[PDB]
Amino acid sequence: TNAALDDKTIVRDYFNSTGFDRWRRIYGDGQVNFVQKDIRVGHQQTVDSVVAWLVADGNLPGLLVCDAGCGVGSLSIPLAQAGALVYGSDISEKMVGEAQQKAQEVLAYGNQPTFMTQDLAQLGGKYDTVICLDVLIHYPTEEASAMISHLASLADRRLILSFAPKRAYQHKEADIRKILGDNGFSIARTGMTSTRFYYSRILEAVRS
Ligand SMILES: C[S@@+](CC[C@H](N)C(=O)[O-])C[C@H]1O[C@@H](n2cnc3c(N)ncnc32)[C@H](O)[C@@H]1O
């Protein structure tokens, strides 16, 4: 018997249990405390900023996009609404199930994202753009490095990441940029969401 479950299992079990209930609420509608409300608003800003980047490029309709660690589809759904071909995945079956429910309710039989329960490190195939928002916060830098390298291998052109700049882990921007550089990516656009209880640094990386 192990002294500890691996980080992925701990995170997965959390988002399949009480984490599902708490984050479905934060990412959804209904009463929240002022801390949770701040997180809801901040996270919405991060999502909206990324959608805005992709819309601004003019090539979003028909674009193949991987949304790794998609949660309840907060990013996947608006990208699909804008015409992207979205492939969302999450390690938590509960989060994935909710994403599909929310998608079916608002998109019906139109351009829906495709949702799969899977560890992002096990994803295959190739995409124009790979996106991983507010997921790396759950892993130490060493593991985050391996995750970024795997995501990079799926990205033909672009990788977009967000992280808390230096349970929960902060990452040094210098470290994240180094890992991206090691994988053959240069930094293009960047962003930053800063509220009272929510901090998310956003990097757009493009294959050079
Ligand atoms: C804070 S939520 C962010 C969700 C989504 N990216 C968003 O911004 O709306 C973190 C999500 O990452 C997922 N996650 C954590 N580790 C993962 C992994 N190794 N592979 C895929 N998803 C993972 C969790 O299940 C959780 O749904």
From Swiss-Prot:
Protein's pathway: Porphyrin-containing compound metabolism; chlorophyll biosynthesis (light-independent)
EC number: 2.1.1.11
CDD domains noted in UniProt: AdoMet_MTases
Keyword Lipoprotein among record annotations: no
Catalytic activity: Mg-protoporphyrin IX + S-adenosyl-L-methionine = Mg-protoporphyrin IX 13-monomethyl ester + S-adenosyl-L-homocysteine
Enzyme class, spelled out: transferase
Gene Ontology molecular function: any one: methyltransferase activity
Family classification: Belongs to the class I-like SAM-binding methyltransferase superfamily. Magnesium protoporphyrin O-methyltransferase family.
Protein name from the UniProt record: Magnesium-protoporphyrin O-methyltransferase
Organism: Synechocystis sp. (strain ATCC 27184 / PCC 6803 / Kazusa)
Lineage: Bacteria, Bacillati, Cyanobacteriota, Cyanophyceae, Synechococcales
